[PDB]
Design a protein around this ligand. Sequence first.
Ligand SMILES: *C/C=C1/C(=C/c2[nH]c(/C=C3[NH+]=C(/C=C4\NC(=O)C(C=C)=C4C)C(C)=C\3CCC(=O)O)c(CCC(=O)O)c2C)NC(=O)[C@H]1C
Ligand SMILES: *C/C=C1/C(=C/c2[nH]c(/C=C3[NH+]=C(/C=C4\NC(=O)C(C=C)=C4C)C(C)=C\3CCC(=O)O)c(CCC(=O)O)c2C)NC(=O)[C@H]1C
Lengths: 499, 500
Amino acid sequence: LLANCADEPIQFPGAIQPHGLLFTLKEPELTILQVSANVQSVLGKVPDQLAGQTLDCVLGAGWAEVIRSTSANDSLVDVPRLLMSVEGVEFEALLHRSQEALVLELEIQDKAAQAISYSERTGNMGRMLRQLHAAADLQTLYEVSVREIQRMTGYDRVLIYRFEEEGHGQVIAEASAPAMELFNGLFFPASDIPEQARELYRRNWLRIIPDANYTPVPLVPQLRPDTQQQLDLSFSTLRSVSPIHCQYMKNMGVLSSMSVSLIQGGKLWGLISCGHRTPLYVSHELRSACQAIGQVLSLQISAMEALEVSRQRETKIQTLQQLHQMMATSDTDVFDGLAQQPQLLMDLVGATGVAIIEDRQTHCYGNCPEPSDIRALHTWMMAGGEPVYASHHLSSVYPPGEAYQTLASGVLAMSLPKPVDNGVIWFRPEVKQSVQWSGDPNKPLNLDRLQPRTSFEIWKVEMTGIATKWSHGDVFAANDLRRSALENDLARQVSKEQQ
Amino acid sequence: VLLANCADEPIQFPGAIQPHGLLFTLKEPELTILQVSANVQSVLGKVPDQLAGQTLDCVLGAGWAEVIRSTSANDSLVDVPRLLMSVEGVEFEALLHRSQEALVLELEIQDKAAQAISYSERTGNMGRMLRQLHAAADLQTLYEVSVREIQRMTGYDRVLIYRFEEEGHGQVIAEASAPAMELFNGLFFPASDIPEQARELYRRNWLRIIPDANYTPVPLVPQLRPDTQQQLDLSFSTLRSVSPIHCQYMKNMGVLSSMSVSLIQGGKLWGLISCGHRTPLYVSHELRSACQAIGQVLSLQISAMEALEVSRQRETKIQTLQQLHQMMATSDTDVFDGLAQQPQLLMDLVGATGVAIIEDRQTHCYGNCPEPSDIRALHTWMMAGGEPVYASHHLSSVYPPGEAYQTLASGVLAMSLPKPVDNGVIWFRPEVKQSVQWSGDPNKPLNLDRLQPRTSFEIWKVEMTGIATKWSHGDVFAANDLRRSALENDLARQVSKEQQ
Ligand SMILES: *C/C=C1/C(=C/c2[nH]c(/C=C3[NH+]=C(/C=C4\NC(=O)C(C=C)=C4C)C(C)=C\3CCC(=O)O)c(CCC(=O)O)c2C)NC(=O)[C@H]1C
Ligand SMILES: *C/C=C1/C(=C/c2[nH]c(/C=C3[NH+]=C(/C=C4\NC(=O)C(C=C)=C4C)C(C)=C\3CCC(=O)O)c(CCC(=O)O)c2C)NC(=O)[C@H]1C
């Protein structure tokens, strides 16, 4: 029943939001296949008679000719601005193709939207990129990015919601209006954004919901007279959203949303979420500018993540070189010579326990668990086959790890690729962390049709059995130590065979 | 030595500024004038000699001096907004920085043509430009759209993407030229065009503009600051006189205006977005900053797609690497012998036409292989460096005895296991005859007379021999992965042999 949250066909809602008009048409002659029901009020045209008719009937001859010229022999990926005044109401036109048919969306521009101009709100664009490149911290990047986005959009709340591996996400940047609830640092259940929503947003990197009280406007005819199926509004900005999400936004107290998908290597790294207490529409030009800001944000995040990884590598290079020098001139087994100086090995990874296993002898330094427990863990670790392994919560993946979770809640293990059972394990003790959640972690939904949770208060969750995160430099140091041990061990076996 | 004189001039201390602006180096607290450019005798009509030890209120007015004082007070001078002033009826754009405990303020003179140009329309397609940059799937597309946008905003006839090489010389990879204008696409340029001093300066200052090449430098009076009795360091000053040799070089090219943005990748001068105009024309500082931001985005996207290409090569070589690893694991012989069991797969792993496998006084050659003695001499030379892997596209350049077999093996990709036993795998690529294009005389960078830039700018063919096809990033990745697999398998075999 929880999994029902990821079963709705969001790609085929059969309706569009009332803030615009939709026209799915045949490509060559621009004959109308289906039209949204909103044309009974806007432009005053009956949607039933608008079947198998050219765009000239409703949109006028000149605008239809312009659309025909634009869509002819074009990939529809570099279409310029298209603003039309159709019976005195202004529309911004976007073109794409769903299934061998031309889908055209007319976003209705109100007087407030017309007053807003793309020049002044994007005048500080170059200064914003200069600040982005000049920022030396990720927090500075987030702060200036959400500040600029709030400046152009004008929304009360702007969030940077980064997703985790399991699905749930965390807010890391917050820019809120006065007397407005703060979600900085709060974790949210994965049910807020289902797998279907994430999959859709991996392709469409821009979504806007001006109002949460809107009544969806159905598409007539519902079935296309081409394949007798439902129109795929996957890349359509004029797509009705699930009513559960509207109720969720109402429960949060916001009535307008605007999200830009952040993509890093084809994965939904995070979302630039936005929130307004009152309905308000954002022009498509500003939305595209925010999308470009999001792509630049992802690029700079990747750049500084690589910078941090290289900084950790540089600060661990000296320790790695010292350990390599000790290993090369020990004349004993590689891990024995490594264990000759235990404190240096400890500070190489910053762990409080060292366990070195070499063919039925295990040596423990510092805060070390029971040797039998470490042996059982080690024989479990070789089953995966990975040369190195890092785990910040051993009890989560290793059920018998709860007994010694107070002593060893973080395990960083690395072993040489030889039949002899050998390896090096670093243990980090548990740190008691009160993770902050927005609402009930154990009650994501008010089971009644699914209903979003009404309560949005901060809950403390004392998450036990989790140690300090292993940094990228930590696993880099483990891998470099493994490589040095490989080289030195090969040298020793070759020399021993020679002599 | 005399050629090295190209990298000895003190460009950071020219002692003069270009006439298209005004310079004011001042004391920080009271904004008292330390030195002022000599151009104030014509602009604003002030004697530069009497303007010593005087506040900015004397020349710049009370309100503008107060604004500058407020801006420079308790500020890092890295986020200063626009500063436009109308000083005795002529407009200036003000830039602030600090050289040595003193406030350096540059007033770029904005002409009527510059005033007519607005930052809105020329940057209206900014978001579309970034969308095109991110949507481009090829480096050539990136270069094309980048130079197209930069030419659109700047209006210059020629725009070049000049990427530097390791040795200093660079190559143009993007070209956007006006009709009836000479093309430099694909041409190589000698390293003497941009000396080491210029590269070092541009590594810090990522924006340079020279509106005119016939300008007479305007000296700074007093020449020596009455603080340390030294010369003012105009390293980060846009109003800095350039070397006359560079002006003569630009005149020889036929251009009278230049505009370059430094491209930085990991703290290194990857390349320059060079520009060229046949007539003098000034570009406002706002458009120059926008072009600088475009250059930084260009570098970021270049790095992104370079990583993408490296990962694509890794992916397309993963299957071959896995097959070779499977063959290595179940051979029961020596690692390189089992590797040599299938020579064609090893060849197509790196796309080389010669394979040489060395294992303890036996060398096995497959395909186009040199003389075994030559390969042995090369191999004993290779272990001297100590690098686990080595890639060379021109062996004769670094290995003098490699000219004998340059027709057969001009590219060497070698990888060896870290053991006392002399073992290794070498891949040989044959020489490909390439006619490198140079702009002018490669053997005569300068017309030795003071150094004089070369007058001739015609295309010269240079048949560069002894150079094989470049080893790709995927090539060295495959070599390193093969080395790692050989390391793991060899350790397993020695451990098993010791056990039994
Ligand atoms: C089990 C079903 C539920 C549900 C489904 C659902 N939700 C969306 C859309 C979104 N939900 C979002 C979540 C947040 N908005 C915020 O402001 C914050 C944090 C402060 C969170 C975690 C977001 C960002 C979206 C995207 C839309 C937007 O607001 O821009 C969908 C997708 C609907 C569609 O695209 O048509 C679905 C199916 N959400 C729940 O919470 C439960 C009740
Ligand atoms: C041995 C001395 C010489 C000399 C010195 C020199 N040159 C510069 C400045 C530049 N030279 C550049 C070269 C090019 N411009 C182009 O258009 C092309 C290709 C089509 C090339 C290779 C460039 C780009 C610069 C930077 C300035 C600019 O044009 O934007 C300096 C630096 C002077 C200063 O910064 O004050 C110096 C010392 N150049 C020679 O060719 C010889 C004669």
